[PDB]
Design a protein around this ligand. Structure first.
Ligand SMILES: [Mn+2]
Ligand SMILES: [Zn+2]
Ligand SMILES: [Zn+2]
Ligand SMILES: [Zn+2]
Ligand SMILES: [Zn+2]
Lengths: 49, 1409
RNA sequence: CUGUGCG
């Protein structure tokens, strides 16, 4: 199972998330971590497309 | 009369009081035995026989000493020598409780009469002989036991309690299940039970409890919750940050926005740094000569080789002055070039005892004692020559008149201003620390380290006398006779720390510099020296900690660039201002962050984070911490990017409070504060009976006040909200809790297992005629606030032990309590981690004033109706004994400290002081004993309080499941708990449930502290914070633990404890770059203590594989391998160890011969193992060439601070106040005196041992200087020369025994964002078959004499006494004082999991065999 | 019970 439907990067988000590889991820946090690298910096795996 | 006549012939088998003595026969024999033991007790101390036993005043009236109407005291043995009398009152008490009681009651009763003897006459010498047995010196101690036995057998065949009181003392010895004393009433027990067990029924049905809880929830929802009277509220993070900025960041304060201006020590550190960085940072031959002769003179200072101390100081000053005038000649310019650049200040010269004395005043004092006392030099040098002919290196110093003309010439040459020592407490030229290079900040930390080491050494100065007249603390003092500590900073400039007082107290120091002789003042401050030990050498540990914390915020390049220098400045201010207020504020910040991350927090949270500054030095620290919190938390949208990193950073910033030590800056002030915290709840409650009886007979008013306190304790209704803060418990709610516990409704059931049931002549509800369960109040040093502490007498300690064991067994029979059960704590940790990962409502609850509000009466009311059924009998075991001991605890007497009474008698407003004054003479006499209903002692009924808390918390979980249809699971620890609530189907709908739970907890005695938090983001339990998908490592806490608690007795033990601390810190993911710096700091500590560097100790240059799947033995092996680069000899020794391991395991033919081969030592054992494995005498001589000086060779280092070690550890395993700076001072003091033993009993210096070395420099003495020496380089000192390769062999063999055969292969090197943390398990493969009674058999088989003596003198399981490796890997442990494998084998990992970053595991070494 | 040890 994935996380608790939170950002896993800010925790202050439970609406319209997206899974990285084992947890969830907000939209703005995903776009912030993807626009600087390809890894996740939370799970340390490549971010989705 | 069959045994009455036998005593006539029995007593004949036994110097003055005997012939006179040889149913009054009973008392005749009693008096005979008493006189016999009394004459035996006094013939050892030269008493006088009292043939008349007249009195105490008659023996003074006969001789002539005036009698000032003394109270009639019967003296057993008096020894009056002219004008001095020694009173000896003896007693025979076998049981330790009655022994200590009679001892104290005798000492007090003789001091009360010594007071009046000192008021008129002589001051007696009090002696009391506490014979715990009946062993005399007239017989062989076997007849007196027969006499006592027959006396018992004649009394048992024949006031209220005499026929059992008299025999209870002639028996051998005296737990629970003993209610057969009297079980009598005192016309007060029934009135106590009428107010303690009147409203308890315990047989309530379940449906009625359900309906009553439903109605109570309905009432609470519309009466206490809708009215806004709840104790919990939502976060509103904006409001939280505003309140934080308003409470911490002082805006209405006129202090500057600069830490250096407001803190005097920070200003001094800045001055020293930026005057040593901008300016500078046979030349070192004369300074070395001066330092050597100064050390020599400091040696003969504390040797008492003279009559007086002033004459000793004058003689050493004469020696130093003669050395100065000798160095003045034979050199072109020695003083003006090397004294100005070394150790000399304006007009003053450095002397012994850390002193500096003006040269003119020095020659003025030397003119005396030589002018008014001629021929003094000759007879003061001849007394030194014939006393220590080893310090006779003084040849041209201890001579006649030291060229007074040349002396005054030197004095008039260096005429500079004297140190001012500013005693009285602006422009802001401070370069704006934020805008400093990364080198100037490290220089600030190094300067703080040097000044802190000088502060520590200032506490080292022994109590000397001032040679000059005091011309001292008004506004300023031109120093002429101050002590000075010298800290070296740069090639030319050196810092001086002047101070005028000694000891461990707070002083006013003055820091000066010497660039090239121009002594410039750097400042003057006031501090306590023993609070500056953490930065003593951690100029790089704290820098590495700050670097790691800043790297945690690498997600926002620009946030770390702002929070980096702010964090370094915060650490610097915390170190330069160690105060309990800063600790309290940083703990408050921890709780604020815990509330900020979650969603629900207490309404009175911010009211507890406020800490009165009382100084700008606290204002700057609070401003820095609040600014850090705001910079990391404030913002609208793009301010919670990586909130896990932010929470970790801020939690570590809050745990930076552990950098400040906990040593009670003022002991009397902290005792006063402890007494205040102890007596304020009682005075506020209304039950503070003072000095009740100390025996157990309360007066009418005292019984009335106790019954009133008990009634007030149980007078809390269930429908009132104006009583949710006063101590007490609702009787109906407790009845519901107990009734649900009895009928198996709670998660903890009464069906327990392993029944816990396992002079005091008459007992009652108050006492047992053996005291009144007297405790004594004191404090316990903690980080935030000093905890309470109760030190009890022997009998009350036994009673607490009884009740604590009962409650601990009951709790072990329970399920959800985790205080002394690590399995349940790990289950709680797993459940809390799963709850935080699943988004459950974790409620981290703390309970305020748990001890000071809990009452043994509450535990009585609980246990009165608890079922506590048996596992096999189902008989409802009666709790009469436990209830009787809890009644004794209800009427306990807590002795207040005598210092507190004295401080309150010689005395602003204070509630405790007001109560003291009101009890001084208004009602009775001075208060010395306090009895009360509430305030169960912290650490006294810990297990009983945990049992009550667990039962009540399971009832609260049942109530929550009933009312709000949630799934709660709670884990308590008797102080704090955590409740994981799985909710059905934010967190604003569960605020009502939280407020209702708090209300119900307060209706019991479980007042939820404002530090408790409720949320779905982070949980806390036992200071272990768990976050979504991880756990906060608490780096700063463990780093500060490694820098603190340096309990340095022996350097080996110090290194061992530091290694265990670094292991437990790497387990919680600290670093491998910070742990190597901690190890470097500890090695630098050991090296500074004069012990020098040794091939063992703290492990530098380590990887995670040295801590994961590796013990201390493997770390020492890796250290030895790092010593031997390009491993040709260590590889050969590892091959030999593998060969021995194969011959003992594969060939399996080696046993009891290696033990005979090892007991020789290091050279012979290594030679034998090499002949058994390699058999090449050339290679053995090439291997034994590597030596290391072992100071603990012929035993252990002799040390007086403030046989193998395995036997000591086994003895400690079978059987069941001083600061760290003072401990390090004692360590440095013991490691500089005669500590090295030479086997013949003559201890010698470490300097004498290390002077016996020679410059070998033959490519074997150069691979590790001052650590590894040649064999011929230690020909002068060959006794302290052991082969390091033998220790390496032994370490490798024990590592093979412990953690597998992979320790033999050569280390190969491997061919990551610094935040890829993950858990790794120890990859050890034990070849030992994984306890007790196995090492004992091992020692018994091999060593018969060492098992007989020094081991097993107090054992009772000798009827028990073949593991694969317990014969050779035990000799290797016993013969090596620093290996210690058996202590690791008879122990668990204590970590079982290591959080490490993948950046470290990718750089770990590969050693797969 | 006694230390001169930051280079
Ligand atoms: Mn807690
Ligand atoms: Zn991810
Ligand atoms: Zn997000
Ligand atoms: Zn300033
Ligand atoms: Zn050599």
């Amino acid at each position: 199972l994935y996380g608790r439907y939170n950002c896993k990067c800010c925790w202050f988000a439970d609406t319209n998330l997206i899974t990285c590889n084992d947890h969830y991820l907000c939209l703005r946090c995903h776009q912030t971590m993807l626009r600087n690298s390809e890894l996740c910096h939370i799970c340390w795996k490549p971010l989705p497309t | 009369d069959e045994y009455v006549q036998e005593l006539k012939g029995l007593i004949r088998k036994h110097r003055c009081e005997f012939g006179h003595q040889k149913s009054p026969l009973l008392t005749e024999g009693f008096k005979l035995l008493s006189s016999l033991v009394e004459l035996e007790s006094c013939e050892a101390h030269a008493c006088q026989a009292n043939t008349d036993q007249r009195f105490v005043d008659v023996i003074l009236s006969d001789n002539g000493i005036l009698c000032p109407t003394l109270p009639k005291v019967i003296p057993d043995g008096f020894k009056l020598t002219g004008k001095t009398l020694i009173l000896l009152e003896t007693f025979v008490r076998v049981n330790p409780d009655e022994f200590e009681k009679k001892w104290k009651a005798d000492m007090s009763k003789l001091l009360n009469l010594k007071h009046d003897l000192q008021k008129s006459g002589v001051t007696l010498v009090p002696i009391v002989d506490g014979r715990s047995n009946y062993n005399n010196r007239f017989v062989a101690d076997w007849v007196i036991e027969r006499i006592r036995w027959l006396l018992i057998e004649i009394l048992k065949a024949s006031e209220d309690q005499e026929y059992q009181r008299l025999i209870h003392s002639l028996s051998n010895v005296k737990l629970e299940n003993l209610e057969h004393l009297k079980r009598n009433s005192l016309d007060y027990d029934e009135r106590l039970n009428e107010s303690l067990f009147i409203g308890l029924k315990g047989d309530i049905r379940e449906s009625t409890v359900r309906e009553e809880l439903i109605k109570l929830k309905l009432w609470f929802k519309d009466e206490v919750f809708s009215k806004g009277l709840g104790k919990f509220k939502l976060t509103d993070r904006r409001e939280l940050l505003e309140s934080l900025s308003s409470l911490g960041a002082h805006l209405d304060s006129d202090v500057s926005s600069c830490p250096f201006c407001n803190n005097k020590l920070m200003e001094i550190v800045y001055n020293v740094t930026f005057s040593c960085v901008e300016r500078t940072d046979t030349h070192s031959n004369i300074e070395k000569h001066y330092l050597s002769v100064l050390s020599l003179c400091n040696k003969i200072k504390g040797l008492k080789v003279f009559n007086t101390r002033r004459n000793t100081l004058l003689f050493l000053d004469l020696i130093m002055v003669n050395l100065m005038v000798d160095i003045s000649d034979s050199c072109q310019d020695a003083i003006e070039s090397l004294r100005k650049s070394g150790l000399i200040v304006g007009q003053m010269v450095m002397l012994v005892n850390d002193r500096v004395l003006d040269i003119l005043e020095a020659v003025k004092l030397i003119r005396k004692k030589i002018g008014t006392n001629p021929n003094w030099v000759k007879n003061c040098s001849k007394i030194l020559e014939r006393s220590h002919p080893e310090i006779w290196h003084h040849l041209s110093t201890l001579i006649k008149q030291p060229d007074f003309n040349s002396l005054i010439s030197i004095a008039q040459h260096l005429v500079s201003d004297r140190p001012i020592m500013r005693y009285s407490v602006k422009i802001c030229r401070h370069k704006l620390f934020q805008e400093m290079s990364s080198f100037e900040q490290m220089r600030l930390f190094k300067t703080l380290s040097s000044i802190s080491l000088s502060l520590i050494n200032s506490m080292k100065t022994s109590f000397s006398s001032r040679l000059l007249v005091n011309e001292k603390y008004f506004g300023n003092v031109r120093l002429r006779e101050c002590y000075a500590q010298r800290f070296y900073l740069a090639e030319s400039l050196v810092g001086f720390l002047f101070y005028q007082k000694t000891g461990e107290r707070s002083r006013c120091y003055s820091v000066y510099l010497s660039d090239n002789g121009v002594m410039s003042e750097q400042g003057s401050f006031y501090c306590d020296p023993k609070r500056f030990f953490l930065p003593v050498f951690s100029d790089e540990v704290l820098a590495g900690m700050c670097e790691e914390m800043t790297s945690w915020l690498d997600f926002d390049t620009g946030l770390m660039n702002d929070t980096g220098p702010i964090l370094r400045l915060l650490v610097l201010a915390i170190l330069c201002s160690p105060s309990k207020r800063n600790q309290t504020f940083l703990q408050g910040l921890r709780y604020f962050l815990m509330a900020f991350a979650n969603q629900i927090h207490h309404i009175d949270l911010t009211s507890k984070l406020v800490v009165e500054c009382k100084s700008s030095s606290e204002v700057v620290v609070q401003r820095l911490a609040v600014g850090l919190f705001i910079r990391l938390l404030s913002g609208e949208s793009d301010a919670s990017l990586f909130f896990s990193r932010r929470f970790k950073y801020l939690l570590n910033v809050s745990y930076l409070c552990h950098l400040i030590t906990k040593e009670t800056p003022d002991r009397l002030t902290d005792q006063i504060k402890c007494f205040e915290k102890f007596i304020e709840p009682k005075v506020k409650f209304g039950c503070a009976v003072v000095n009740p009886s100390l025996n157990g007979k309360l007066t009418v008013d005292q019984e009335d006040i106790m019954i009133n306190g008990l009634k007030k304790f149980f007078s809390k209704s269930l429908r009132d909200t104006e009583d949710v803060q006063t101590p007490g418990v609702c009787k109906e709610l407790l009845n519901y809790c107990v009734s649900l516990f009895n009928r198996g409704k709670l998660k903890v059931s009464g069906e327990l297992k392993n029944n816990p049931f396992r002079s005091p002549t008459e007992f009652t509800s108050i006492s047992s005629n053996s005291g009144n369960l007297k405790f004594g109040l004191s404090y316990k040093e903690q980080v935030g606030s000093n905890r309470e502490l109760y030190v009890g007498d022997l009998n009350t300690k036994l009673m607490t032990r009884l009740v604590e064991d009962f409650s601990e067994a009951v709790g072990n029979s329970m399920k959800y309590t985790c205080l002394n059960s690590e399995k349940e704590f790990e289950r709680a940790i797993c459940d809390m981690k799963m709850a935080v990962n699943n988004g459950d409502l974790s409620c981290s609850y703390d309970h305020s004033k748990w001890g000071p509000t809990m009452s043994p009466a509450l535990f009585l009311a609980l246990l009165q109706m608890l079922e506590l059924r048996t596992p096999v009998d189902r008989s409802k075991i009666d709790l009469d004994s436990v209830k009787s001991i809890l009644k004794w605890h209800l009427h306990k007497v807590v002795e207040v400290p005598i210092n507190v009474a004295e401080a309150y008698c010689i005395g602003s407003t204070s509630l405790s002081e007001e109560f003291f004054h009101q009890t001084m003479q208004l009602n009775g006499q001075i208060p010395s004993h306090i009895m009360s209903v509430l305030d169960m002692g912290q650490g006294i009924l810990h297990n009983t309080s945990d049992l009550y808390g667990l039962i009540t918390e399971q009832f609260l979980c049942y109530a929550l499941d009933l009312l709000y249809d949630v799934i709660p699971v709670s884990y308590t620890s008797s102080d704090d708990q955590i409740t994981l609530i799985k909710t059905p189907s934010d967190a604003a709908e569960w605020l009502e449930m939280i407020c209702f739970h708090e209300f119900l907890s307060s209706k019991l005695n479980k007042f939820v502290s404002p530090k408790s938090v409720i949320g779905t983001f982070v949980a806390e339990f036992k200071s272990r914070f768990f976050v979504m998908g991880e756990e906060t490592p608490l780096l700063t806490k463990f780093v500060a633990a490694a820098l603190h608690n340096v309990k340095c007795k022996t350097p080996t033990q110090l290194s061992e404890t530091i290694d265990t601390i670094c292991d437990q810190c790497i387990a919680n993911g600290v670093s491998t770059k910070i742990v190597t710096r901690i190890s470097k700091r500890v090695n630098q500590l050991i090296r500074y203590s004069g012990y020098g560097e040794t091939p063992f100790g703290a492990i530098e240059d380590q990887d995670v594989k040295d801590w994961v799947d590796g013990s201390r033995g493997y770390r020492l092996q890796r250290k030895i391998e790092a010593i031997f680069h390009d491993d040709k000899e260590t590889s050969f020794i590892r091959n030999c160890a593998r060969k021995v391991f194969n011959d003992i395991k594969r060939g399996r033919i080696f046993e009891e011969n290696l033990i005979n081969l090892i007991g020789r030592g290091g050279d012979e054992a290594l030679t034998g193992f090499l002949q058994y494995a390699g058999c090449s005498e050339q290679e053995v001589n090439r291997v034994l060439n590597y030596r290391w000086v072992n100071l603990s060779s012929f035993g252990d280092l002799r040390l007086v601070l403030r046989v193998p070690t395995l036997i000591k550890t086994l003895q400690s395993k079978l059987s069941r106040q001083s600061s760290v700076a003072s401990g390090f001072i004692g360590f440095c003091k013991s490691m500089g005196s005669k500590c090295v033993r030479d086997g013949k009993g003559g201890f010698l210096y470490i300097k004498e041992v290390y002077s016996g070395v020679s410059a070998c420099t033959c490519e074997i003495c150069a691979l590790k200087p001052k650590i590894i020496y040649c064999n011929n380089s230690l020909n002068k000192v060959s006794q302290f020369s052991k082969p390091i390769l033998w220790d390496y062999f032994s370490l490798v063999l024990t590592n093979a025994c412990e953690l597998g055969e992979w320790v033999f292969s050569t280390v190969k090197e491997p061919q990551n964002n610094q935040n890829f943390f993950w858990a790794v398990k120890p990859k050890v493969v034990r070849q030992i078959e994984d306890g007790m009674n196995h090492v004992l058999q091992s020692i018994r088989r091999n060593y018969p004499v060492l098992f007989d003596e020094h081991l097993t003198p107090f054992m009772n399981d000798l009827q028990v006494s073949r593991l694969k490796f317990l014969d050779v890997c035990i000799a290797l442990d016993m013969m090596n004082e620093n290996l210690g494998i058996i202590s690791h084998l008879l122990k668990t990992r204590d970590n079982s999991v290591y959080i490490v970053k993948q950046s470290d595991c990718a750089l770990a070494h590969i050693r797969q065999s």
